[PDB]
Amino acid sequence: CQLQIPEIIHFCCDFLMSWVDEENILDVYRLAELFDLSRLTEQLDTYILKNFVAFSRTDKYRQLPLEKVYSLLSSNRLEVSCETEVYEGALLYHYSLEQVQSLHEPPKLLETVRFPLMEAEVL
Amino acid sequence: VNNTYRSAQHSQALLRGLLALRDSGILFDVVLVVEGRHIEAHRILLAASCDYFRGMFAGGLKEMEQEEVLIHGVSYNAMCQILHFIYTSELELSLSNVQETLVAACQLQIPEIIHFCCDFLMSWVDEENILDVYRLAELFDLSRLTEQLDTYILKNFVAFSRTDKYRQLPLEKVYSLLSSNRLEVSCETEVYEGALLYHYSLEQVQPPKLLETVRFPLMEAEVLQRLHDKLDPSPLRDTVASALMYHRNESLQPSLQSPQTELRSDFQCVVGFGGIHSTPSTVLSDQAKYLNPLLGEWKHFTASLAPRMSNQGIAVLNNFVYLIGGDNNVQGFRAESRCWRYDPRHNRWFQIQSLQQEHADLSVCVVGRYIYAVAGRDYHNDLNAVERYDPATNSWAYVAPLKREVYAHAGATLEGKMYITCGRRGEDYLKETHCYDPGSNTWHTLADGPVRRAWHGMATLLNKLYVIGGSNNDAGYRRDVHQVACYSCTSGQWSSVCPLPAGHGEPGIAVLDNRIYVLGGRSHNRGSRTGYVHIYDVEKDCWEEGPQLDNSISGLAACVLTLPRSLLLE
Amino acid sequence: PNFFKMVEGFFDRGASIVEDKLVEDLRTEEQKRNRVRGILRIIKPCNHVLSLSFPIRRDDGSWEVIEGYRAQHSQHRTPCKGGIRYSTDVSVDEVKALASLMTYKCAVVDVPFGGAKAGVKINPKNYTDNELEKITRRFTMELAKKGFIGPGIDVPAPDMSTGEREMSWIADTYASTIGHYDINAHACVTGKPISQGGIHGRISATGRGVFHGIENFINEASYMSILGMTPGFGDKTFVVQGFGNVGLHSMRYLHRFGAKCIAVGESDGSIWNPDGIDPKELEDFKLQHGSILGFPKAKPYEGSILEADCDILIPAASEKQLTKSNAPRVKAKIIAEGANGPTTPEADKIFLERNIMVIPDLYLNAGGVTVSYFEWLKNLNHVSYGRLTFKYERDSNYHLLMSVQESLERKFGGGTIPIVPTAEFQDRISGASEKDIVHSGLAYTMERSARQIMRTAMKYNLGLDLRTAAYVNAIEKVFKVYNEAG
């Protein structure tokens, strides 16, 4: 980045993202925050949007910021399959992962789920 | 596993950086004072500005690593031209910088610059600048404009007789063009007179090795026979007499091969004509279009009086094919009365005499007094009568029975050598497999096939015939046989190849620059022929789109003859 | 090929196989029995087909005409059984082919019915309840006028596009206009709900039939020694393609009696779990929201499930699921056709070549017609099954237990108490109902039909080609019935 090389830096970031292990999860978000690269942040956001389903089961969802996750879910660009999965992800973001595997407090992020878009029987 | 991506606009960035370095006035590592003129510039930028400067003063020699570099023959005009080219980033000639550049390039010892100047002069050659063009041609005489200069001199020999450009024009190229017979000409009457006038002065019309360098017998003697008859005696008249007897020897065309009858060029390919197409396309193939490698497609042309033969035999015997009858009952029997032979050496075709017995789809070798066929069979059924097919002589005579009972078998001369793998008793698979070589006309001992597999697809692997796997109902399903058996006596080792998805039963054998191509095939699962043509290279381990024939035919004969003018011109 | 030719070639094969033995096996005169083989050509064509055209008032005052069809294949047994389909794809050829299939369908399982099929060229989604009411009433009246609805003549049944709701209308519209004087007017149609005279256990009939058919063949040593099973409890894995009524019911019963369901598929994407899938959880998940996508503890398997590794395959989906291309790439050992012709004849020879057992569809899903026959009998009897015998049997069993207890106490002096039944027997006694009798009858019928099919296949020297065995058995039964009258 100091040498003003966009192509090489972007290729290296893409290779690191595509070869990022689970044990090096903390080495990706911190690196993206520190480097402030114009392409690393977009790659991290795309990876989050594509692997939120996997991160929900793991503890990575808890480590991820709640406000950023809510903002990403609010935008009509995340890839989702069913409203139940969206509700489970919202609960995991707004509550402890171990607790899920607390609906007493209605979180603000719960309103981001489109109620009319859900199944009539499920609703 | 690192890769390297290069942008297409990096030249502009490099030029801008060089200009910035030159205008900065700093980062100077080489200081040279010549003729009392002091300037400041970058050595790398100066080397990159010109073309021969980088190869001359930056060649890594002893002079390239010295404070002072000695330059001889470099005038101020060359420096001005280099500066102008560096500033304007343009390399071209004009009406005021043509003679000066050529004059200054003679002492620069730059062959590339001289060739470029000669090419520019040729591209801007007019009647008022004949002397300058001739001087530029004499100074350089580039190997790329030599043919054009020779053609221009020959086409204007009347003016070139008194012009000085004739002496500076190439002589070998003109002589080669004069002896050439494939040159594009719209006529052979005015062109012949023009060539005669160019070669020799009008006074002659009205030792020297170059005179004997012309191969008259090699060229087209049909049009030059009249000229040679009135000319002085030469030993080139024997070829004309020998070729006269070849006109009445259409049946014995393969047998009448001569040392001067070699196949012109190596334009061997697959033409989508001939054969009988039953599956998967119900369309009769009639367009005789030849694929043009320069154009990449088989453009349609006027195929007037094209040789249209159906279910004709396929053989490769010194570029001459001899076959009797034709049978394709495996893919659908189709009676035909037209028989054609591919003889590119003679550039002619004729209707061969039909033999009494329709035996084909075998190996034909040009040996002995006539082509010999291994046993024989009817169109679709075995017969108790054994005879040898002699279409050339049309003589139906009984022959001795073959060692192995083979009817409508498959065989071909792979890489110019006859070979047979396993066998099949017609359309019904048998249990005993015997390899009988049609070339030797005997049951030669070979390795017994442990697995009853036959009628497989054979391609050119390791410069030898190889059959791997197969597709039949003998295995109980449409799977691939793990055992691969190949007999390579010359190689001495088995040739590993991918299994053939489509079986090749009595198909045409074609060799195109050692690149095996398969059209059609046998598909037992579909109950018909193969609707697509696929080539499975073992080394590539992938499926690639090869040359797709117009008609998906099986066992279609390939004809090589004189192409139409429109087809040749693409 | 289409369905008509596919079902037409089977009869030709069966008749050609039968004739040689049937000429002498039934001879009892001038060796003219060969000319008697016109009986076989009588069986082929359908006896009667009828096309209708009736008006409807509509809810907006407009008028429309509706085309309907009904075919009757065989009249060798007076009551005819068939379904009624509400679709725009119906045609005379389809209904006559389905009736032809239904005749042999009934003949295989010893159900004394004929064969029929009906179709109404209509889209149910384009009409409200009132329009469907009017359609059903007018269609039933028009059929009754010409004599295609009578309880002793023709008995309809629900198809995939119709339910018990339409049959409730048919029953009372026939019982109040034409068959008012008929004591058995309510027996004209089967498949109606309980309140108007339905039968219990009608929902799970086809699944029970499929399970019993599979069980009867998975417990035969001779047939499963050809491939090697050690069958019945070896925790054999199975996959179900299509999660409709029959698939769900059969899968639940198979899991209940010791089987592991590995993969479940549908029209959309499938799932996979080597640990097994709980039928109740999957059913609840599907009932909760639409399809079974995103089921927990179910990996979203990709690729052709028909080629997935398993032991039993249940293609309960649309026609010709298995073709020539798919046939050699499957790994299943037993194919259980739960729908109408999942496999094509071109792929049947492929399975026969690699000794893959295929249980015919003509036999596997006869539970639907068996329970319909039972419901028809119940309607004729004017009483539910077992009402007059449950208490008598309970008292008899209690008396037997008391007698054995007293007799055993007599010899051994202390007092033994064998009077107490087991928990399963006590639960069976307490909750006896009609469903038990229906299930018992269905199981008995399936077992007897399986035994007959096996013995026929053994007698005509057939291998694993059970389809031809079933068709030959049906044709022989029909010929035997039809010969001894004319």
Tab-separated table of C-alpha atoms in Angstrom, chain A residues 29-121:
chain	number	residue	atom	x	y	z
A	29	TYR	CA	-10.797	-8.166	11.053
A	30	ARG	CA	-7.913	-6.556	12.950
A	31	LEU	CA	-5.770	-6.482	9.801
A	32	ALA	CA	-8.602	-4.913	7.793
A	33	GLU	CA	-9.196	-2.292	10.493
A	34	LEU	CA	-5.496	-1.428	10.792
A	35	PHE	CA	-4.689	-1.328	7.067
A	36	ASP	CA	-7.873	0.559	6.054
A	37	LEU	CA	-7.420	-0.741	2.514
A	38	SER	CA	-9.952	0.354	-0.097
A	39	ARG	CA	-10.427	-3.285	-1.175
A	40	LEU	CA	-9.797	-5.347	1.978
A	41	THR	CA	-12.876	-3.930	3.728
A	42	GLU	CA	-15.111	-4.814	0.772
A	43	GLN	CA	-13.676	-8.340	0.651
A	44	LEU	CA	-14.274	-8.757	4.390
A	45	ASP	CA	-17.853	-7.503	4.030
A	46	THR	CA	-18.500	-9.919	1.155
A	47	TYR	CA	-17.018	-12.804	3.154
A	48	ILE	CA	-19.234	-11.905	6.121
A	49	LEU	CA	-22.316	-11.713	3.892
A	50	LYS	CA	-21.480	-15.099	2.342
A	51	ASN	CA	-20.486	-16.942	5.547
A	52	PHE	CA	-22.859	-15.447	8.117
A	53	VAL	CA	-24.660	-18.810	8.134
A	54	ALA	CA	-21.459	-20.594	9.156
A	55	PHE	CA	-20.496	-17.845	11.613
A	56	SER	CA	-23.862	-18.080	13.391
A	57	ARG	CA	-23.097	-21.629	14.545
A	58	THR	CA	-19.570	-20.661	15.614
A	59	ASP	CA	-18.505	-17.973	18.080
A	60	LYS	CA	-17.434	-15.607	15.277
A	61	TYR	CA	-20.936	-14.107	15.234
A	62	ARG	CA	-20.621	-13.163	18.911
A	63	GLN	CA	-17.186	-11.626	18.307
A	64	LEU	CA	-18.514	-9.588	15.379
A	65	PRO	CA	-19.954	-6.150	16.213
A	66	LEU	CA	-23.693	-6.085	16.822
A	67	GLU	CA	-24.252	-2.673	15.217
A	68	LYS	CA	-22.372	-3.614	12.041
A	69	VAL	CA	-24.256	-6.917	11.777
A	70	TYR	CA	-27.590	-5.135	12.238
A	71	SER	CA	-26.660	-2.546	9.604
A	72	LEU	CA	-25.659	-5.282	7.150
A	73	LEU	CA	-28.888	-7.201	7.803
A	74	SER	CA	-30.973	-4.047	7.329
A	75	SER	CA	-29.675	-3.575	3.778
A	76	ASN	CA	-31.575	-5.567	1.145
A	77	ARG	CA	-28.443	-7.308	-0.144
A	78	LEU	CA	-27.713	-10.136	2.317
A	79	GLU	CA	-28.196	-13.685	1.040
A	80	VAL	CA	-30.873	-15.459	3.097
A	81	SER	CA	-33.046	-18.524	2.526
A	82	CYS	CA	-35.811	-18.511	5.160
A	83	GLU	CA	-37.132	-16.054	7.731
A	84	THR	CA	-36.489	-18.561	10.536
A	85	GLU	CA	-32.762	-18.486	9.756
A	86	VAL	CA	-32.839	-14.674	9.795
A	87	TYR	CA	-34.576	-14.701	13.184
A	88	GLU	CA	-32.026	-17.187	14.534
A	89	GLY	CA	-29.168	-15.010	13.291
A	90	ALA	CA	-30.713	-11.908	14.847
A	91	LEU	CA	-31.119	-13.746	18.160
A	92	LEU	CA	-27.500	-14.931	18.001
A	93	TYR	CA	-26.367	-11.357	17.329
A	94	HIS	CA	-28.507	-9.911	20.146
A	95	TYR	CA	-27.863	-12.718	22.658
A	96	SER	CA	-25.174	-15.155	23.741
A	97	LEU	CA	-24.532	-18.044	21.362
A	98	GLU	CA	-24.394	-20.517	24.258
A	99	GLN	CA	-27.728	-19.225	25.572
A	100	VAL	CA	-29.406	-19.897	22.217
A	101	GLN	CA	-27.894	-23.393	22.041
A	102	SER	CA	-33.319	-14.813	25.367
A	103	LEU	CA	-36.510	-13.342	23.894
A	104	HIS	CA	-37.528	-11.435	27.039
A	105	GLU	CA	-35.924	-8.202	25.793
A	106	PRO	CA	-37.035	-7.127	22.294
A	107	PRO	CA	-33.837	-5.976	20.577
A	108	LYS	CA	-33.876	-3.217	17.983
A	109	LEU	CA	-32.183	-5.501	15.441
A	110	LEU	CA	-35.231	-7.792	15.538
A	111	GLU	CA	-37.243	-5.158	13.649
A	112	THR	CA	-34.896	-5.533	10.660
A	113	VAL	CA	-36.557	-8.860	9.803
A	114	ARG	CA	-39.340	-8.397	7.248
A	115	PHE	CA	-42.407	-9.801	9.004
A	116	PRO	CA	-44.649	-9.771	5.883
A	117	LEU	CA	-41.952	-11.644	3.934
A	118	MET	CA	-42.207	-14.646	6.283
A	119	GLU	CA	-44.496	-17.643	5.834
A	120	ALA	CA	-48.115	-17.115	6.856
A	121	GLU	CA	-48.196	-20.230	9.046
